[PDB]
Write a protein that binds this ligand. Structure first.
Ligand SMILES: Nc1ncnc2c1ncn2[C@@H]1O[C@H](COP(=O)(O)OP(=O)(O)OP(O)(O)=S)[C@@H](O)[C@H]1O
Ligand SMILES: Nc1ncnc2c1ncn2[C@@H]1O[C@H](COP(=O)(O)OP(=O)(O)OP(O)(O)=S)[C@@H](O)[C@H]1O
Ligand SMILES: Nc1ncnc2c1ncn2[C@@H]1O[C@H](COP(=O)(O)OP(=O)(O)OP(O)(O)=S)[C@@H](O)[C@H]1O
Ligand SMILES: N[C@@H](CCC(=O)O)C(=O)O
Ligand SMILES: C[C@@H](O)[C@H](N)C(=O)O
Ligand SMILES: [Mg+2]
Ligand SMILES: [Mg+2]
Ligand SMILES: [Mg+2]
Lengths: 293, 315, 335, 325
């Protein structure tokens, strides 16, 4: 095509899945679209405290053309409510839709979404907006100062998130500890109306594939030390939709209080970065210690 | 980093709180006795109400402060549902405390609570007064509904005197090893107008700015309270003097006309020397000028005309 | 021919380009040179009714963008639209943040196409103070892609921060000295035959409003065409169409006031108000008569000037014309 | 890109060294950041004195060029109700820094537009999280701020811009552009600025536009008056002289001619005459009272429209009657 970027596919599950994953970040706000030869990424940020990035790779599209030469990537911003409404009306007859193509022609042009059916094609153009000065790359995991890492199965994490949500969890604490004889302890401690509750993942290579505590440098493994991360549930719960489709989840917390969740569902890959609370109260610390001991 | 002096030197104990000596002594008596009743603490900003209530709770509950105190303020959710669930569950909690000690529910800025929540608090206080006690903190005691006031002992804090402000300022200076002069401390106290939070903020700003707290150095950053300037302007016996004050001391310093007229109304409300007829006529003229300003004509000419009319009223 | 003759003269002869705008060169020059400098600032047009503010902004937008690009580069809101704080914070903000649309090759070759949009807030003086405050940082933050144009008759209704943010342009009153050429051109285009001095009389009566003068000229032309006698229009007909009290009636009022009898003045005013004369015109004519009269002293002129000012302010407040006129006449009689 | 911007935004200070006319405040804040002891700040002042520019420059100095990542800026164009304070501001203030870059900064520009409930909710947010966060409030009207919020903030007053700072900024703009300004033109520009730099920049841009050949033409006071359509001092002096010495007919004719020569507005003439009379030495004080009252009434009436000729005659009569005392 004559467009700078044009990607067409026959699977409509990827688009709706990505939109559903992005929904928990606000039904009426902005979404950033990054376009490059590797693929197309959707980025959202909330309150400068949490960030989500969902990547659709080149393999997911039956055809993918990126003819831009001056710039190696293209950045645009759209309103999520517009896309949500347009797709909801256009996707009412989900059985008949056969092709879906995205297109873009550089700055100053709309983002074009076309649903192609057997004999009817629907074309919608989304207006673009200036990108806010805030840089989404600011909230990133310092890969040289990982406090701990863990690999978890998607279903168990999704069940834990559902349990936390249903009890009206208000504060969450991620507790990670390692010992000898391959003893691992990964737990989520919730402060809610019920008081203090705990959800502990088993130390087996089917729900907790691996767990490591690196003493805040990613190199030296230390046993007997416990890493505790304090988060507000309003931001922690925003990964529930992503975990619903997730096949594997990788938690990585650094010393700067940044937690990164890598969700793997050819596929959809999601990155969620969140900041930790300023500090933990004495009562919360005492309750957590009593729960874990 | 280093905390600002206002938060760094917040008292931890009742003994370090100055001003309202009788009230603080009563609070210390309650703290050392234990039988704390429902209480309301009212007063102007920055005089130690929050500090006093928190210190009293800490001293009363000792190690049990974490599990025996429930603190809520205007920045938290405090609707009727909160009263129905969180406060109710806290008051129902069975906590073993030393004899004469009770759980404390601190409601800072209680005046802002909604009517429904305040009405709901009545039954909670009636049912759980045996093991729970409420400490309301507010600026306007009348903003708490009468049924709640009926159960509480009232405690009104007065504005701090220059002596107590000077004493605590000297303590802070001794702790910080700050070089100063007497005139500088007098200027700081004069500008504070009885608000100690402002006094400490201005002291820190002056110490940073020049290191030595002099009157000239204090007045370089901190300005004299504009209400006193407005009072001097209004009480001037000559129209020329009033106009000169309005120009040099208020208009040329960037004070907005709306602020000037509002301050003029507030000051005129408390002019004891003037007669009642003159006072009400001045209030009428100030109100007319305020109405003109609100329409968009916020000019120096309107303020000058208001001053001229006030002077006519005086004659 | 009928299609072109299906519009009132005010809309028919609305300026198309900035060259057609008259008597407002002090701002038109800056706006014109902006077409080359491409450095348009935020604008605050203010002035009395019918001086060419809306026409000027429309002509500027047309010259900048053109028939096609304008539809994507212009957002116009006026008093007929909802302009609450929510509107300012959502719709205006969204448009101001919109990316600059790509011009077409024809647009680029035919028009300058500056790289920003324009938001026009006509009758901005009707907006609330809070809504105006909501615009302050929107105007500054997105000045790289958006420029604001506020238009008003009462500049004091614009909050000071907005006036500071906007470069101010005062539109002058259009009178017989600076707007005569445009009116003469309009009359020539319509073949309106009038006696010498009629156009100047119309402009004097309009009192700074060219729209009113054009409407009066159209009314006179319609009357002359209906009569179909071939005679030139006269100043008396223009005065009658404009609602000017005849000189004899004003003289009768003046003699009644000079007599000083309350009952006679009351009866004469009661009979006079039956005709339906607008009190504003009568007050203006009385001011012109008394202030320029050489038979009265300085104290009388000072007192009557203050009385006329008070009466005019009261009338502008929307008061009963009969009561105000009778009070003014009695007061002048007691002088 | 900066070339296309309006001069008011093109010349926005980027560093604290570029902010003029606020030496005391600027020195205090600079040394505070040098010592890393920034308290909660309030910047109170009239329009266009450099409050927003100063706070943005301070944020840039504190956080270098990445201030946008650890600075939360909110103004009147955004909703700032009690729900916003409870959720967004609270969550930002209670979270750790991006890279442990000291403390976070929250800027509440135009905070006088916030509701009482939101301001009340802000008190404990400011107090509790002082260690991790610092608040900056900016205002033009202090009466809209609650007493508690004022008590919690260290106050700094931005005065109207002094003449020397305006001259230095004008010289900087003139060297930046290829523009020449006459001393009388600069004096008139400062006089009409009223301590607002935005007005100076806008009028200078309009004057440059007015020049036929800006590469060589020099801006004179006449150019400034043409661009602003304001009366000249000579016109005001002549009108006042005619009012105070000539008869009613002569004064009326003089006022009409002076106004028709350049299409001057009556309100501008009234303001100029008021400024002139403020320096007059009056031996009778009732004259000042009558002048002020009547001229304020005339200004208020003009603000709502009305008849222009009647208002001008009213000004003449009011001045004459006041000086007849
Ligand atoms: N009586 C006092 N003695 C010593 N320091 C005081 C006193 N009053 C105020 N301060 C200082 O000011 C700070 C604020 O005191 P607070 O008690 O929180 O103010 P406040 O009386 O609660 O005003 P409001 O109602 O909350 S606006 C304290 O942390 C102290 O540093
Ligand atoms: N300067 C002018 N040059 C030419 N025609 C003008 C001029 N001013 C007014 N007119 C005529 O009057 C009509 C109305 O002009 P506008 O630009 O709408 O006046 P206005 O300043 O917008 O009046 P307001 O403020 O809305 S009451 C135009 O369509 C023209 O026919
Ligand atoms: N002190 C100053 N030094 C230099 N330029 C200034 C100064 N103050 C204002 N300016 C100029 O005026 C513009 C506006 O300044 P601001 O700081 O945004 O105004 P302000 O003080 O915030 O007034 P408000 O409250 O927003 S109406 C700046 O971009 C500069 O071009
Ligand atoms: N009306 C005053 C004159 C005022 C003056 O000339 O200043 C007499 O005496
Ligand atoms: C002129 C005269 O009235 C003077 N002002 C007195 O006496
Ligand atoms: Mg308090
Ligand atoms: Mg118009
Ligand atoms: Mg500002």
């Amino acid at each position: 095509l004559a467009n700078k970027f044009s990607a067409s596919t026959v699977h409509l599950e990827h688009i709706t899945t990505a939109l559903s994953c992005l929904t928990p970040f606000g039904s009426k706000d902005d979404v950033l679209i990054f376009i490059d030869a590797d693929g197309l990424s959707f980025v959202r940020e909330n309150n400068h405290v949490i960030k989500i990035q969902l990547l659709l790779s080149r393999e997911l599209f039956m055809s993918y053309s990126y003819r831009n030469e001056t710039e190696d990537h293209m950045k645009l911003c759209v309103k999520i409510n517009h896309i949500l409404d347009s797709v909801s009306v256009m996707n009412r007859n989900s059985d008949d839709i056969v092709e879906c193509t995205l297109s873009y022609d550089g700055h100053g042009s709309p983002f074009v979404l076309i649903f192609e059916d057997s004999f009817i094609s629907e074309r919608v153009e989304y207006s673009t907006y200036l990108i806010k000065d805030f840089d989404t790359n600011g909230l990133e995991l310092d890969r040289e100062r990982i406090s701990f890492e863990a690999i978890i199965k998607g279903e168990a994490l999704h069940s834990a998130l559902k349990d936390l949500k249903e009890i009206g969890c208000k504060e969450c604490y991620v507790y990670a500890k390692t010992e000898a004889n391959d003893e691992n302890v990964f737990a989520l401690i919730s402060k809610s109306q019920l008081g203090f509750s705990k959800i502990k993942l088993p130390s087996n290579r089917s729900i907790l594939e691996k767990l490591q505590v690196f003493d805040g440098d990613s190199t030296t493994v230390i046993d007997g030390f416990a890493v505790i991360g304090f988060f507000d549930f309003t931001s922690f719960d925003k990964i529930r939709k992503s975990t619903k489709i997730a096949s594997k989840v990788l938690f990585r917390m650094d010393v700067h209080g940044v937690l990164s969740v890598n969700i793997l569902s050819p596929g959809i890959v999601i990155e969620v970065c969140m900041l930790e609370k300023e500090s933990i109260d004495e009562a919360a610390q005492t309750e957590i210690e009593l729960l874990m001991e | 980093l280093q905390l600002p002096w206002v938060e760094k030197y917040r008292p931890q104990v009742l003994s370090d709180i100055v001003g309202n000596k009788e009230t603080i002594d009563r609070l210390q008596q309650i703290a050392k006795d234990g039988n704390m009743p429902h209480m309301i603490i009212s007063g102007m900003p920055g005089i130690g109400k929050t500090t006093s209530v928190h210190c009293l709770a800490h001293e009363l509950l000792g190690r049990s402060y974490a599990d025996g105190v429930l603190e809520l303020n205007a920045s938290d959710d405090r609707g009727i549902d909160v009263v129905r669930n969180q406060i109710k569950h806290f008051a129902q909690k069975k906590l073993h405390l030393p004899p004469g000690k009770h759980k404390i529910v601190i409601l800072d800025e209680a005046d802002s609570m909604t009517a429904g929540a305040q009405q709901a608090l009545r039954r909670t206080m009636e049912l759980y007064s045996n093991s729970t006690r409420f400490a309301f903190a507010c600026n306007q005691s009348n903003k708490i509904i009468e049924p709640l006031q009926s159960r509480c002992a009232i405690l009104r804090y007065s504005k701090l005197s220059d002596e107590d402000v000077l004493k605590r300022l000297l303590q802070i200076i001794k702790l910080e090893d700050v070089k100063y002069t007497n005139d500088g401390l007098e200027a700081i106290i004069f500008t504070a107008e009885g608000d100690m939070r402002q006094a400490i903020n201005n002291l820190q700003s002056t110490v940073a700015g020049h290191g030595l707290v002099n009157a000239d150095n204090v007045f370089k950053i901190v300005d004299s309270p504009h209400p006193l300037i407005v009072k001097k302007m209004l009480l001037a016996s000559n129209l020329e003097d009033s106009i000169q004050i309005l120009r040099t001391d208020l208009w040329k310093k960037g004070y907005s006309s709306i602020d000037i007229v509002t301050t003029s109304f507030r000051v005129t409300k408390n002019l004891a020397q003037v007669k009642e007829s003159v006072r009400l006529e001045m209030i009428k003229e100030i109100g007319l000028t305020h109405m003109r300003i609100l329409e968009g004509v916020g000019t120096y000419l309107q303020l000058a005309s208001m001053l001229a009319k006030i002077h006519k009223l005086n004659n | 021919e009928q299609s072109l003759a299906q519009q009132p003269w005010v809309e028919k002869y609305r300026p198309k380009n900035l060259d057609e705008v008259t008597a407002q060169d002090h701002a038109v020059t800056v706006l014109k040179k902006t077409l080359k400098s491409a450095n348009l600032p935020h604008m605050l047009f203010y002035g009395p009714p019918g001086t060419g503010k809306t026409s000027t902004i429309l002509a500027l937008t047309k010259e900048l963008y053109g028939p096609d690009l304008m539809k994507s580069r212009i957002l116009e809101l006026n008093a007929s639209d909802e302009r609450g704080i929510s509107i300012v914070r959502e719709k205006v903000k969204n448009f101001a943040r919109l990316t600059v649309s790509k011009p077409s090759k024809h647009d680029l070759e035919n028009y300058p196409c500056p790289p920003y949009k324009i938001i026009i807030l006509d009758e901005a003086d009707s907006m609330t103070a809070d809504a105006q405050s909501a615009l302050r940082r929107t105007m500054e933050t997105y000045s790289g892609v958006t420029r604001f144009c506020l238009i008003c008759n009462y500049v004091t209704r614009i909050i000071d921060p907005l006036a500071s943010r906007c470069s101010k342009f005062r539109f002058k009153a259009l009178d017989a000295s600076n707007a005569i050429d445009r009116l003469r051109f309009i009359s020539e285009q319509e073949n309106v035959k009038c006696d010498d001095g009629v156009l100047e009389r119309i402009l004097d009566i309009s009192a700074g409003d060219l729209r009113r003068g054009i409407t009066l000229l159209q009314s006179a032309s319609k009357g002359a065409q209906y009569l179909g006698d071939g005679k030139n229009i006269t100043s008396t007909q223009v005065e009658e169409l404009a609602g000017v009290v005849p000189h004899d009636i004003l003289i009768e009022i003046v003699e009644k006031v000079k007599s000083g009898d309350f009952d006679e003045i009351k009866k004469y005013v009661n009979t006079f108000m039956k005709s339906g004369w607008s009190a504003a015109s009568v007050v203006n004519q009385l001011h012109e008569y008394y202030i320029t009269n050489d038979n009265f002293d300085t104290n009388f002129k000072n007192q009557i000037s203050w009385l006329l000012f008070t009466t005019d302010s009261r009338l502008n407040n929307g008061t009963n014309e009969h009561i105000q006129l009778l009070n003014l006449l009695v007061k002048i009689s007691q002088l | 890109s900066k070339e296309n911007l309006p001069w008011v935004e093109k010349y926005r200070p980027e560093t604290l060294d570029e902010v003029y006319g606020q030496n005391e405040v600027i020195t205090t804040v600079r040394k505070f950041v040098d010592e890393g002891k920034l308290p909660h700040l309030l910047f109170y002042g009239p329009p266009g004195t450099g409050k927003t520019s100063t706070i943005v420059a301070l944020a840039r100095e504190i956080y270098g060029k990445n201030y946008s990542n650890m600075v939360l800026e909110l103004n009147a164009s955004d909703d700032r109700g009690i729900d916003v304070v409870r959720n967004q501001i609270k969550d930002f203030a209670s979270t750790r820094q991006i890279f442990s870059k000291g403390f976070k900064l929250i800027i509440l520009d135009e905070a006088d537009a916030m509701t009482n409930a939101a301001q009340n909710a802000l008190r404990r947010v400011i107090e509790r999280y002082t260690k991790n966060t610092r608040f900056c409030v900016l205002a033009n009207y202090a009466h809209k701020l609650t007493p508690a919020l004022l008590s919690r903030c260290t106050r700094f007053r931005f005065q109207p811009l002094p003449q020397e700072a305006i001259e230095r900024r004008i010289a900087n703009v003139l060297v930046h552009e290829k523009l020449k300004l006459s001393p009388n033109a600069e004096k008139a520009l400062i006089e009409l600025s009223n301590g607002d730099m935005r007005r100076v920049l806008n009028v200078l841009q309009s004057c440059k536009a007015t020049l036929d050949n800006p590469d060589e033409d020099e801006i004179s006071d006449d150019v400034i008056y043409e661009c602003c359509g304001a009366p000249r001092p000579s016109d005001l002096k002549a009108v006042l002289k005619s009012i105070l010495e000539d008869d009613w007919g002569t004064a009326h004719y003089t006022l009409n001619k002076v106004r028709s020569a350049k299409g001057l507005a009556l309100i501008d003439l009234i303001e100029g005459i008021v400024k002139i009379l403020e320096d007059y030495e009056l031996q009778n004080e009732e004259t000042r009272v009558h002048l002020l009252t009547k001229l304020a009434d005339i200004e208020y009436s003009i603000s709502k429209g009305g008849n222009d000729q009647i208002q001008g005659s009213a000004v003449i009569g009011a001045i004459k009657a006041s000086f007849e005392n």
